[model samples]
Target: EDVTLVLTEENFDEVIRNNKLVLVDCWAEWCAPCHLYEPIYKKVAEKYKGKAVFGRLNVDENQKIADKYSVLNIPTTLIFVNGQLVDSLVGAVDEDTLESTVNKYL
Candidate 1:
Protein backbone atom coordinates (compact mmCIF):
# COMPACT_ATOMS: atom_id res chain seq x y z
CA GLU A 1 0.00 0.00 0.00
CA ASP A 2 2.57 2.50 1.11
CA VAL A 3 6.35 2.38 1.07
CA THR A 4 6.33 1.15 4.66
CA LEU A 5 7.49 -1.93 6.51
CA VAL A 6 5.08 -3.44 8.93
CA LEU A 7 7.81 -4.30 11.37
CA THR A 8 6.98 -7.01 13.89
CA GLU A 9 8.64 -9.65 15.99
CA GLU A 10 9.15 -11.69 12.83
CA ASN A 11 10.87 -8.95 10.80
CA PHE A 12 12.81 -6.93 13.38
CA ASP A 13 15.48 -9.53 13.93
CA GLU A 14 16.41 -9.56 10.24
CA VAL A 15 17.44 -5.91 10.29
CA ILE A 16 16.91 -4.22 6.97
CA ARG A 17 14.93 -7.20 5.82
CA ASN A 18 17.39 -8.20 3.11
CA ASN A 19 18.33 -4.65 2.20
CA LYS A 20 21.86 -3.35 2.15
CA LEU A 21 20.82 0.17 2.97
CA VAL A 22 17.54 0.36 4.81
CA LEU A 23 15.82 3.51 6.06
CA VAL A 24 13.29 2.97 8.81
CA ASP A 25 10.84 5.71 9.64
CA CYS A 26 9.30 5.06 13.04
CA TRP A 27 6.12 6.98 13.54
CA ALA A 28 2.69 7.01 15.24
CA GLU A 29 -0.79 7.97 14.07
CA TRP A 30 -1.35 10.46 16.86
CA CYS A 31 1.64 12.47 15.83
CA ALA A 32 0.51 15.26 13.53
CA PRO A 33 4.06 15.69 12.37
CA CYS A 34 4.13 12.11 11.20
CA HIS A 35 1.17 12.75 8.93
CA LEU A 36 2.99 15.67 7.38
CA TYR A 37 5.95 13.46 6.58
CA GLU A 38 3.98 10.86 4.64
CA PRO A 39 4.39 12.34 1.18
CA ILE A 40 8.13 12.88 1.44
CA TYR A 41 8.56 9.41 2.81
CA LYS A 42 6.67 7.89 -0.11
CA LYS A 43 8.53 10.08 -2.59
CA VAL A 44 11.86 8.95 -1.21
CA ALA A 45 10.77 5.34 -1.54
CA GLU A 46 10.22 5.90 -5.26
CA LYS A 47 13.33 7.98 -5.75
CA TYR A 48 15.51 5.39 -4.12
CA LYS A 49 13.66 2.40 -5.50
CA GLY A 50 16.81 0.53 -6.42
CA LYS A 51 19.52 2.49 -4.65
CA ALA A 52 18.11 2.12 -1.12
CA VAL A 53 15.17 0.78 0.84
CA PHE A 54 12.67 3.15 2.48
CA GLY A 55 10.44 1.71 5.14
CA ARG A 56 7.98 3.01 7.73
CA LEU A 57 6.91 1.30 10.91
CA ASN A 58 3.94 2.34 13.01
CA VAL A 59 5.14 2.82 16.55
CA ASP A 60 1.66 2.65 18.00
CA GLU A 61 1.04 -0.80 16.65
CA ASN A 62 4.63 -1.97 16.91
CA GLN A 63 5.64 -0.68 20.31
CA LYS A 64 7.92 -3.60 20.89
CA ILE A 65 10.09 -2.65 17.98
CA ALA A 66 10.16 0.94 19.14
CA ASP A 67 11.19 -0.12 22.61
CA LYS A 68 13.98 -2.21 21.18
CA TYR A 69 15.38 0.84 19.40
CA SER A 70 14.61 3.21 22.31
CA VAL A 71 12.56 5.35 19.99
CA LEU A 72 11.34 8.30 22.04
CA ASN A 73 9.87 10.41 19.32
CA ILE A 74 7.17 10.06 16.69
CA PRO A 75 9.40 10.22 13.66
CA THR A 76 12.67 8.60 14.38
CA THR A 77 14.55 7.86 11.21
CA LEU A 78 17.01 5.02 11.42
CA ILE A 79 19.39 3.91 8.73
CA PHE A 80 20.90 0.47 8.69
CA VAL A 81 23.53 -1.32 6.67
CA ASN A 82 23.97 -5.08 6.70
CA GLY A 83 21.73 -5.44 9.77
CA GLN A 84 23.69 -2.83 11.68
CA LEU A 85 22.60 0.64 12.65
CA VAL A 86 24.52 3.28 10.76
CA ASP A 87 22.72 6.53 11.57
CA SER A 88 19.65 8.06 13.15
CA LEU A 89 17.53 11.22 12.75
CA VAL A 90 14.76 12.27 15.09
CA GLY A 91 11.59 14.36 14.69
CA ALA A 92 9.67 15.60 11.65
CA VAL A 93 12.09 16.86 9.02
CA ASP A 94 12.06 18.35 5.56
CA GLU A 95 12.74 16.35 2.43
CA ASP A 96 16.20 17.84 2.07
CA THR A 97 17.03 16.82 5.62
CA LEU A 98 15.75 13.32 5.06
CA GLU A 99 17.74 12.97 1.86
CA SER A 100 20.85 14.26 3.54
CA THR A 101 20.56 11.81 6.41
CA VAL A 102 20.04 8.84 4.10
CA ASN A 103 22.63 9.90 1.52
CA LYS A 104 25.36 9.66 4.09
CA TYR A 105 24.45 6.04 4.86
CA LEU A 106 24.10 5.03 1.22
Candidate 2:
Protein backbone atom coordinates (compact mmCIF):
# COMPACT_ATOMS: atom_id res chain seq x y z
CA GLU A 1 0.00 0.00 0.00
CA ASP A 2 1.61 3.06 -1.16
CA VAL A 3 1.81 5.81 -0.51
CA THR A 4 3.69 2.94 1.35
CA LEU A 5 1.50 3.17 4.52
CA VAL A 6 -1.83 2.77 2.80
CA LEU A 7 -3.21 0.01 5.04
CA THR A 8 -2.65 -2.15 8.04
CA GLU A 9 -4.83 -4.99 9.21
CA GLU A 10 -6.43 -2.01 10.85
CA ASN A 11 -7.90 -0.90 7.54
CA PHE A 12 -6.94 -3.17 4.62
CA ASP A 13 -10.29 -3.87 3.04
CA GLU A 14 -10.92 -0.34 1.84
CA VAL A 15 -7.56 -0.34 0.09
CA ILE A 16 -8.60 -3.39 -1.89
CA ARG A 17 -11.86 -1.67 -2.71
CA ASN A 18 -10.05 1.09 -4.53
CA ASN A 19 -7.24 -0.96 -6.09
CA LYS A 20 -9.60 -3.71 -7.32
CA LEU A 21 -6.87 -6.28 -8.16
CA VAL A 22 -4.56 -6.94 -5.25
CA LEU A 23 -1.98 -9.44 -4.02
CA VAL A 24 -2.16 -9.64 -0.24
CA ASP A 25 1.05 -11.60 0.45
CA CYS A 26 0.45 -13.57 3.67
CA TRP A 27 3.81 -14.34 5.25
CA ALA A 28 5.93 -14.63 8.41
CA GLU A 29 9.41 -13.71 9.63
CA TRP A 30 10.55 -17.32 10.02
CA CYS A 31 9.12 -18.63 6.81
CA ALA A 32 11.75 -19.80 4.30
CA PRO A 33 10.09 -18.94 1.03
CA CYS A 34 9.54 -15.43 2.24
CA HIS A 35 13.16 -14.96 1.27
CA LEU A 36 12.33 -15.69 -2.32
CA TYR A 37 8.83 -14.25 -2.16
CA GLU A 38 9.83 -10.64 -1.75
CA PRO A 39 12.32 -10.40 -4.58
CA ILE A 40 10.10 -12.26 -7.01
CA TYR A 41 7.07 -10.41 -5.75
CA LYS A 42 8.82 -7.18 -6.59
CA LYS A 43 10.13 -8.61 -9.81
CA VAL A 44 6.70 -9.47 -11.07
CA ALA A 45 5.14 -6.53 -9.33
CA GLU A 46 6.81 -4.20 -11.83
CA LYS A 47 4.17 -4.51 -14.53
CA TYR A 48 1.26 -3.80 -12.20
CA LYS A 49 2.91 -2.21 -9.18
CA GLY A 50 0.69 0.70 -8.19
CA LYS A 51 -2.51 -0.48 -9.80
CA ALA A 52 -2.47 -4.16 -8.81
CA VAL A 53 -1.53 -3.49 -5.16
CA PHE A 54 0.49 -5.59 -2.69
CA GLY A 55 -0.44 -5.96 0.99
CA ARG A 56 1.87 -7.50 3.56
CA LEU A 57 0.62 -9.42 6.64
CA ASN A 58 3.21 -10.85 8.93
CA VAL A 59 3.77 -12.91 12.16
CA ASP A 60 4.34 -9.68 14.07
CA GLU A 61 1.86 -7.25 15.61
CA ASN A 62 -0.96 -5.76 13.66
CA GLN A 63 -1.05 -9.43 12.76
CA LYS A 64 -4.14 -10.80 14.49
CA ILE A 65 -5.85 -10.60 11.13
CA ALA A 66 -3.72 -13.55 10.00
CA ASP A 67 -5.82 -16.03 11.98
CA LYS A 68 -9.14 -14.67 10.72
CA TYR A 69 -8.34 -15.75 7.15
CA SER A 70 -7.73 -19.43 8.08
CA VAL A 71 -4.69 -19.48 5.83
CA LEU A 72 -2.66 -21.56 8.32
CA ASN A 73 0.33 -21.33 6.05
CA ILE A 74 3.28 -19.11 5.27
CA PRO A 75 3.69 -16.91 2.18
CA THR A 76 0.18 -17.30 0.90
CA THR A 77 -0.01 -14.91 -2.03
CA LEU A 78 -3.55 -13.87 -1.17
CA ILE A 79 -4.83 -12.93 -4.58
CA PHE A 80 -7.72 -10.52 -4.26
CA VAL A 81 -9.86 -10.21 -7.33
CA ASN A 82 -11.75 -6.95 -7.13
CA GLY A 83 -11.66 -6.91 -3.32
CA GLN A 84 -12.55 -10.63 -2.99
CA LEU A 85 -9.79 -13.11 -2.14
CA VAL A 86 -8.98 -15.90 -4.58
CA ASP A 87 -5.58 -17.45 -3.96
CA SER A 88 -4.78 -19.90 -6.75
CA LEU A 89 -1.04 -20.18 -6.32
CA VAL A 90 0.72 -20.81 -3.00
CA GLY A 91 4.36 -21.11 -1.85
CA ALA A 92 7.72 -20.19 -3.43
CA VAL A 93 7.27 -19.88 -7.13
CA ASP A 94 9.71 -18.75 -9.85
CA GLU A 95 9.45 -15.37 -11.52
CA ASP A 96 7.73 -16.57 -14.66
CA THR A 97 5.56 -19.00 -12.74
CA LEU A 98 4.28 -16.37 -10.31
CA GLU A 99 3.87 -13.71 -12.95
CA SER A 100 1.96 -16.16 -15.12
CA THR A 101 -0.46 -16.96 -12.33
CA VAL A 102 -1.39 -13.39 -11.37
CA ASN A 103 -2.27 -12.78 -14.96
CA LYS A 104 -5.19 -15.17 -14.54
CA TYR A 105 -7.54 -12.74 -12.83
CA LEU A 106 -7.08 -9.96 -15.36
Candidate 3:
Protein backbone atom coordinates (compact mmCIF):
# COMPACT_ATOMS: atom_id res chain seq x y z
CA GLU A 1 0.00 0.00 0.00
CA ASP A 2 2.93 2.31 -0.54
CA VAL A 3 2.24 5.39 -2.61
CA THR A 4 5.86 5.93 -3.49
CA LEU A 5 7.69 3.91 -6.09
CA VAL A 6 10.79 2.09 -4.84
CA LEU A 7 13.70 2.15 -7.23
CA THR A 8 16.59 -0.19 -6.66
CA GLU A 9 19.57 -1.55 -8.53
CA GLU A 10 17.55 -4.51 -9.82
CA ASN A 11 14.46 -2.64 -10.99
CA PHE A 12 16.08 0.61 -12.01
CA ASP A 13 16.39 -0.01 -15.73
CA GLU A 14 13.09 -1.81 -16.09
CA VAL A 15 11.01 0.76 -14.27
CA ILE A 16 12.54 3.69 -16.10
CA ARG A 17 11.91 1.91 -19.36
CA ASN A 18 8.30 1.29 -18.47
CA ASN A 19 7.52 4.84 -17.37
CA LYS A 20 7.81 7.77 -19.74
CA LEU A 21 8.41 10.43 -17.12
CA VAL A 22 10.19 9.45 -13.94
CA LEU A 23 11.80 11.29 -11.07
CA VAL A 24 14.23 9.30 -8.95
CA ASP A 25 15.51 10.93 -5.79
CA CYS A 26 18.87 9.44 -4.89
CA TRP A 27 19.66 9.52 -1.20
CA ALA A 28 21.24 7.63 1.62
CA GLU A 29 19.75 6.39 4.92
CA TRP A 30 22.31 8.31 6.98
CA CYS A 31 21.96 11.59 5.12
CA ALA A 32 20.55 14.53 7.04
CA PRO A 33 20.05 16.48 3.83
CA CYS A 34 17.94 13.61 2.52
CA HIS A 35 15.96 13.74 5.75
CA LEU A 36 15.04 17.37 5.07
CA TYR A 37 14.32 16.94 1.38
CA GLU A 38 12.47 13.60 1.39
CA PRO A 39 9.39 15.01 3.11
CA ILE A 40 8.96 17.58 0.35
CA TYR A 41 9.54 14.86 -2.21
CA LYS A 42 6.88 12.65 -0.68
CA LYS A 43 4.38 15.51 -0.68
CA VAL A 44 5.05 16.10 -4.34
CA ALA A 45 4.66 12.39 -4.98
CA GLU A 46 1.29 12.44 -3.27
CA LYS A 47 0.19 15.58 -5.08
CA TYR A 48 1.08 14.18 -8.47
CA LYS A 49 -0.05 10.63 -7.69
CA GLY A 50 -0.19 8.96 -11.10
CA LYS A 51 0.88 11.58 -13.59
CA ALA A 52 4.62 11.14 -13.41
CA VAL A 53 6.37 8.52 -11.38
CA PHE A 54 8.11 9.68 -8.20
CA GLY A 55 10.50 7.32 -6.47
CA ARG A 56 13.47 7.08 -4.18
CA LEU A 57 16.79 5.33 -4.66
CA ASN A 58 18.85 4.44 -1.64
CA VAL A 59 22.29 5.29 -2.93
CA ASP A 60 23.83 3.65 0.07
CA GLU A 61 22.34 0.34 -0.94
CA ASN A 62 22.43 0.75 -4.69
CA GLN A 63 25.77 2.16 -5.71
CA LYS A 64 25.60 0.38 -9.05
CA ILE A 65 22.66 2.47 -10.18
CA ALA A 66 24.17 5.56 -8.59
CA ASP A 67 27.37 5.09 -10.55
CA LYS A 68 25.52 5.05 -13.86
CA TYR A 69 24.54 8.68 -13.28
CA SER A 70 27.65 9.48 -11.27
CA VAL A 71 25.58 10.59 -8.34
CA LEU A 72 28.00 12.20 -5.91
CA ASN A 73 25.55 14.00 -3.70
CA ILE A 74 23.52 12.23 -1.04
CA PRO A 75 20.47 14.09 -2.20
CA THR A 76 20.02 14.22 -5.94
CA THR A 77 16.99 14.09 -8.18
CA LEU A 78 17.51 12.24 -11.44
CA ILE A 79 15.03 13.10 -14.11
CA PHE A 80 14.17 10.60 -16.80
CA VAL A 81 12.14 11.12 -19.94
CA ASN A 82 11.39 8.65 -22.72
CA GLY A 83 13.51 6.10 -20.82
CA GLN A 84 16.58 8.28 -21.05
CA LEU A 85 18.33 10.21 -18.35
CA VAL A 86 17.58 13.85 -19.01
CA ASP A 87 18.44 16.17 -16.13
CA SER A 88 19.23 16.14 -12.43
CA LEU A 89 18.59 18.47 -9.52
CA VAL A 90 21.26 18.19 -6.87
CA GLY A 91 21.11 19.03 -3.14
CA ALA A 92 18.27 19.88 -0.81
CA VAL A 93 15.69 21.93 -2.69
CA ASP A 94 12.40 23.52 -1.73
CA GLU A 95 9.00 22.09 -2.70
CA ASP A 96 8.36 24.88 -5.20
CA THR A 97 11.67 24.22 -6.89
CA LEU A 98 10.82 20.53 -7.18
CA GLU A 99 7.27 21.09 -8.39
CA SER A 100 8.40 23.66 -10.93
CA THR A 101 11.10 21.37 -12.23
CA VAL A 102 8.70 18.45 -12.57
CA ASN A 103 6.18 20.76 -14.24
CA LYS A 104 8.59 21.53 -17.04
CA TYR A 105 8.84 17.88 -17.99
CA LEU A 106 5.14 17.24 -17.62
Candidate 4:
Protein backbone atom coordinates (compact mmCIF):
# COMPACT_ATOMS: atom_id res chain seq x y z
CA GLU A 1 0.00 0.00 0.00
CA ASP A 2 2.85 2.33 0.80
CA VAL A 3 4.20 3.39 -2.56
CA THR A 4 6.63 6.00 -1.34
CA LEU A 5 9.85 4.68 0.15
CA VAL A 6 12.75 6.46 1.83
CA LEU A 7 16.01 5.53 0.17
CA THR A 8 19.07 5.42 2.43
CA GLU A 9 22.65 4.33 2.05
CA GLU A 10 21.93 1.30 4.20
CA ASN A 11 19.04 0.03 2.11
CA PHE A 12 19.70 1.96 -1.06
CA ASP A 13 21.14 -1.00 -2.91
CA GLU A 14 18.54 -3.47 -1.72
CA VAL A 15 15.78 -1.09 -2.70
CA ILE A 16 16.57 -0.02 -6.24
CA ARG A 17 19.56 -2.38 -6.35
CA ASN A 18 18.12 -3.63 -9.66
CA ASN A 19 17.09 -2.44 -13.09
CA LYS A 20 13.78 -0.67 -12.60
CA LEU A 21 12.16 2.59 -13.52
CA VAL A 22 12.86 4.40 -10.28
CA LEU A 23 12.51 8.06 -9.43
CA VAL A 24 14.54 9.25 -6.47
CA ASP A 25 14.08 12.71 -5.08
CA CYS A 26 17.21 13.97 -3.38
CA TRP A 27 16.04 16.50 -0.81
CA ALA A 28 16.90 18.25 2.49
CA GLU A 29 15.03 19.53 5.58
CA TRP A 30 16.17 23.15 5.57
CA CYS A 31 15.06 23.43 1.98
CA ALA A 32 11.74 25.25 1.86
CA PRO A 33 11.12 24.41 -1.76
CA CYS A 34 11.83 20.77 -1.07
CA HIS A 35 9.26 20.80 1.72
CA LEU A 36 6.72 22.49 -0.49
CA TYR A 37 7.28 20.02 -3.26
CA GLU A 38 6.88 17.04 -0.92
CA PRO A 39 3.13 16.63 -1.29
CA ILE A 40 3.22 17.11 -5.03
CA TYR A 41 6.00 14.57 -5.31
CA LYS A 42 4.08 12.17 -3.12
CA LYS A 43 1.06 12.48 -5.36
CA VAL A 44 3.19 11.79 -8.38
CA ALA A 45 4.53 8.73 -6.62
CA GLU A 46 1.06 7.54 -5.75
CA LYS A 47 -0.29 8.14 -9.22
CA TYR A 48 2.54 6.21 -10.80
CA LYS A 49 3.02 3.85 -7.88
CA GLY A 50 2.43 0.55 -9.67
CA LYS A 51 4.22 1.66 -12.83
CA ALA A 52 7.33 3.13 -11.23
CA VAL A 53 9.20 2.88 -7.97
CA PHE A 54 9.13 6.19 -6.06
CA GLY A 55 11.54 7.06 -3.31
CA ARG A 56 13.51 9.85 -1.68
CA LEU A 57 16.97 10.41 -0.20
CA ASN A 58 17.76 13.19 2.21
CA VAL A 59 21.08 14.81 1.36
CA ASP A 60 21.73 16.36 4.77
CA GLU A 61 21.47 13.06 6.60
CA ASN A 62 23.20 11.04 3.94
CA GLN A 63 26.14 12.91 2.52
CA LYS A 64 27.91 9.90 1.09
CA ILE A 65 24.77 8.68 -0.64
CA ALA A 66 24.17 12.17 -1.97
CA ASP A 67 27.70 12.43 -3.33
CA LYS A 68 27.52 9.00 -4.85
CA TYR A 69 24.63 10.17 -7.00
CA SER A 70 26.38 13.47 -7.80
CA VAL A 71 23.54 15.48 -6.31
CA LEU A 72 24.70 19.10 -5.96
CA ASN A 73 21.34 20.77 -5.48
CA ILE A 74 18.98 20.62 -2.52
CA PRO A 75 16.03 19.37 -4.53
CA THR A 76 17.24 17.12 -7.27
CA THR A 77 14.93 14.62 -8.91
CA LEU A 78 16.75 11.73 -10.50
CA ILE A 79 15.12 9.21 -12.76
CA PHE A 80 16.68 5.82 -13.17
CA VAL A 81 15.69 2.96 -15.41
CA ASN A 82 17.47 -0.35 -15.75
CA GLY A 83 19.67 0.74 -12.83
CA GLN A 84 21.12 3.62 -14.80
CA LEU A 85 20.61 7.36 -14.47
CA VAL A 86 18.39 8.50 -17.28
CA ASP A 87 17.27 12.04 -16.50
CA SER A 88 17.18 14.58 -13.67
CA LEU A 89 15.33 17.65 -12.48
CA VAL A 90 17.48 19.94 -10.33
CA GLY A 91 15.06 22.28 -8.59
CA ALA A 92 11.59 22.85 -7.24
CA VAL A 93 8.92 21.61 -9.62
CA ASP A 94 5.18 21.88 -9.86
CA GLU A 95 2.97 18.80 -9.94
CA ASP A 96 2.22 19.11 -13.65
CA THR A 97 5.85 19.59 -14.58
CA LEU A 98 6.98 16.77 -12.35
CA GLU A 99 4.30 14.45 -13.70
CA SER A 100 5.28 15.27 -17.26
CA THR A 101 8.87 14.30 -16.53
CA VAL A 102 7.74 11.06 -14.99
CA ASN A 103 5.69 10.32 -18.08
CA LYS A 104 8.91 10.10 -20.10
CA TYR A 105 10.03 7.11 -18.08
CA LEU A 106 6.64 5.46 -18.33
Q: Give the top-scoring candidate (TM-score).
A: 3
Could you give candidate 3's per-residue lDDT for residues 1-106 as a string of tens digits?
3467888867888888998889998988799999998888888888888988998999888888889899998799999998998988899878998899788888
lDDT of 3 at 93: 74
Question: TM-score, each model?
Answer: 0.85, 0.79, 0.93, 0.87
Cα lDDT tens digits for candidate 4, 1-106: 4578888878777656574788888898899989988888888888886788888998888899889878998699888877778887888777888888778667
lDDT of 3 at 89: 86
**Model 2 quality (TM-score):** 0.79
| Best candidate, lDDT | 3
How close is each model in CA RMSD to the real structure? 1.9, 2.8, 1.4, 1.8
Instruction: Arrange candidates, best lDDT first.
Output: 3, 4, 1, 2
- What's the distance in Å from true for residue 73, model 1? 1.1
Between candidates 1 and 3, name the one with more favorable lDDT. 3
Q: Model 1: per-residue lDDT, tens digit, 2-58?
A: 555566666766747578888888987788888888888888777777788777788
User: Judged by lDDT against the true structure, how good is candidate 2?
Assistant: 0.68
Alpha-carbon runs more than 4 Å astray in model 1: 15-17
lDDT of 2 by residue, 1-106 (tens): 2222234666687877777677767766778888768766766776666657766666455456666676676777777787777763568667787677677767
Clash totals for all candidate models: 0, 0, 0, 0
- Least accurate stretch of 10 residues (summed lDDT) in model 2? 1-10
Record all residue pairs in model 2 with backbone atoms less than 3 Å apart, i.e. clashing.
Answer: none
